[PDB]
């Protein structure tokens, strides 16, 4: 399971006729690190099978 | 039935054609949309939180 806790806001900027640039306004709440979770026991079994 | 074909996975041409086709599909979908080359300027950056 992978997650990106930050709550971003996208802001649009006009740089020419019909040309738009999508910047980032700010973040609502707290700034937290993105991360991924794996289960330890299942990974242990998988590594044991791979070693075998 | 009654058949045994000699297979090889390291020398087949399907992988090369799939690679070049994926590259071509990636390239042709970036033509219509915006070309960001006024953005190469001198930025001025600060920390977001203090």
């Amino acid at each position, epitope marked *: 399971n992978c997650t990106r806790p930050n*709550n971003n*806001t996208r802001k649009s900027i006009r740089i020419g006729p019909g040309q738009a640039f999508y910047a980032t*306004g*700010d*973040i*609502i*709440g707290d700034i937290r690190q993105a991360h991924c979770n794996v289960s330890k026991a299942t990974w242990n079994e998988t590594l044991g099978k791979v070693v075998k | 039935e009654n058949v045994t074909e000699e297979f090889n996975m390291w020398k087949n041409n399907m992988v090369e054609q799939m690679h070049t086709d994926i590259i071509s599909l990636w390239d042709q979908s970036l033509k219509p949309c915006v070309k960001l080359t006024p953005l190469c300027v001198t930025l001025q950056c600060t920390n977001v939180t*203090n």
Partner: antibody, heavy 119, light 108 residues
């Protein structure tokens, strides 16, 4: 997070109020910042609420003269109400919402407060 | 101050006190955003009950909220000598507009 509030002494009957509370260990962005006021006897009526990128709100009984804003470079928030009367003299607190950043219902963090007696 | 409370309440140690906060249907019956605060005479208030039936971390679990129709009730059970403080009720009245109450000074 620390909220340090400041206001100038005693105010004239026609001179406007300028209130500012600096934030410490916070971004002054992504959080709802609100002002609440209580007269010496009893109180806790809320003046206004602000956010950087979302819609603010004002008290209908004071919507006429509430012009509040925020400053990101210096991490400050300004009430800057005007057209003051002698009857609204009271002490002010500034507060911010929870870690969610989108709720202005309850205000966990608060500040010291200021007297701001009207002369 | 649309929301109103009884001016004061009292009791004895080891007893329970119930405080009622009332409002119109559009005020309290619209949503569950109801909060209760306490403040000492020389200090700023702090949140004790938020979202009617939830409490902040690191507080004694001796307070509660019922949302009885359009009226909210706060119960304090097993009060002590240092639980004497004013109790304010606040609620949301649409467009991020809060409405407070007159407060209830609990003495013992």
């Amino acid at each position: 997070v620390q909220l340090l509030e400041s206001g100038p002494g005693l105010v004239r009957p026609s001179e406007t109020l300028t209130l500012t509370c600096s934030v410490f260990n916070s971004r002054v962005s992504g959080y709802y910042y609100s002002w609440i006021r209580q007269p010496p006897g009893r109180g806790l009526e809320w003046i206004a609420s602000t956010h950087f990128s979302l819609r603010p709100s004002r008290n209908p009984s004071l919507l006429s003269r509430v012009t509040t804003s925020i400053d990101t470079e210096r991490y400050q928030v300004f009430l800057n109400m005007r057209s003051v009367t002698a009857a609204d003299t009271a002490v002010y607190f500034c507060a911010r919402g929870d870690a969610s950043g989108w709720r202005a219902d309850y205000f966990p963090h608060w500040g010291q407060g200021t007297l701001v007696v009207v002369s | 101050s649309v929301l109103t409370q009884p001016p004061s309440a009292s009791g004895s140690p080891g007893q329970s006190v119930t405080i009622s906060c009332t409002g119109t249907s559009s005020d309290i019956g619209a949503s569950d955003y109801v909060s209760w605060y306490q403040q000492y005479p020389g200090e700023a208030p702090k949140v004790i009950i938020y979202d009617v039936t939830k409490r902040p971390s690191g507080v004694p679990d001796r307070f509660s909220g019922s949302k009885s129709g359009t009226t909210a009730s706060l119960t304090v059970s097993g009060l002590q000598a240092e639980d004497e403080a004013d109790y304010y009720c606040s609620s949301d009245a649409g467009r991020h507009t809060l409405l407070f109450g007159g407060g209830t000074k609990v003495t013992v």
